[PDB]
Every structure is written in C-alpha cells, then in structure tokens.
Write a protein that binds this ligand. Sequence first.
Ligand SMILES: [Ca+2]
Ligand SMILES: [Ca+2]
Lengths: 62, 145
Amino acid sequence: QIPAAASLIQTAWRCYAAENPDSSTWKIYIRISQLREHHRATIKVIRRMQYFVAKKKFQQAR
Amino acid sequence: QLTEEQIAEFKEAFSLFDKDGDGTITTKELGTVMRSLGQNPTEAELQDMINEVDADGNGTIDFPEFLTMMARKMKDTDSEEEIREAFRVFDKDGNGYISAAELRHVMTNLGEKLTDEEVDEMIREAGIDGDGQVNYEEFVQMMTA
Ligand SMILES: [Ca+2]
Ligand SMILES: [Ca+2]
C-alpha cells in the first residue's frame, strides 16, 4: 500500500541524509536560527523514532 | 559494541527530552521538544512514536527503552529488505527502475512530503539515466551501507 510505502522510504532517507552535516535536509528547520549541537541531537532522535513508526506501519500494510 | 562515550551522549540526549527529571519521557515532553523545533505534531503521531519505543507498555519511555531504540540496527539485511519492498510498490512493471518524475511526485506529495531540495539531493545521488529512470536498488544500498 502506497502511503505506508512512501513514509518508509521518506523517513529512512531523512535518517540517512541527517548523517551528512551539510545536507539540505537541515535547511527545513526554519524555526531554528542557528543549528547547534543539542539541535542536531534531538532532531536525529526524532527522525529515528519516525522511521521505526513507519517501518511498523509498512509491515502492517505489507 | 557500546562504549562509555556512546552512553554518555545517549544519556545527555535522553535528558533534553525528559524535562521533568523523573526518568521517563511523556508524549507531552516529546511534543514540547518537537514543537520548539518548529514542528506541529498531532497527538496521534506523538502516541505512535512513544508506543514504538515503549517496550513494556506503560505509556512512557524509560532510559533502557531509549537505549534499545538508539542501538537498534537500521542498516541490517531485514531492514534493507523492507525498504527494497517499499520501492517495489512504485515499480509498476517490476523492472527495478522507477520513473524520476514518478519518484519526485511520490516523495513530495505523499506520506511525510519531502521538500523539493531534499528530493533534488536524493535523486542526484542515484543518478538519472538517459531514459529518465532511477535504479532504486541504488537507494537500498547507499542507505544501508
Ligand atoms: Ca519526564
Ligand atoms: Ca515504558
């Protein structure tokens, strides 16, 4: 099923791209004026959690 | 395969979320960290995140459960197969290629909706061929390498 498939791909890619400090995935946090270390900390955690959520829904849908 | 440097960082990260200090992460506290990063998570999303980490089922995240989440493998053979099986959804004729135009549409307009700059970077890494197609096994490999 298509929504679960897309979310698995997109959350996996957001985890992977966040390992690159110069990736454009960092430019979307316009609420933060200067990305600092604790910012890159919490973001990486959140994206990780959103990947395991999407993995779980993809398993249910396939 | 876990150091005292790795655990110190995971413990400092755990406390950025546990605003209470009671040793436990609540949906409310997770929503507060997300909302300060400028995200607007629904309660449904916050409860799903907590429920995928909360192993014992009491509705909160203790440090051991946080550790399991941070140490859980993402680049293994089984996760590789799930991502691969996710791309096959969009490979309508099962030939190993997705149309670059179909890929960018799905990535920007379905699911979590990536930005156009995020998809530019994503599609630039696999390459588009002369025929406008993207070999998606390239994503499966470069993301799990
Ligand atoms: Ca707490
Ligand atoms: Ca718990």
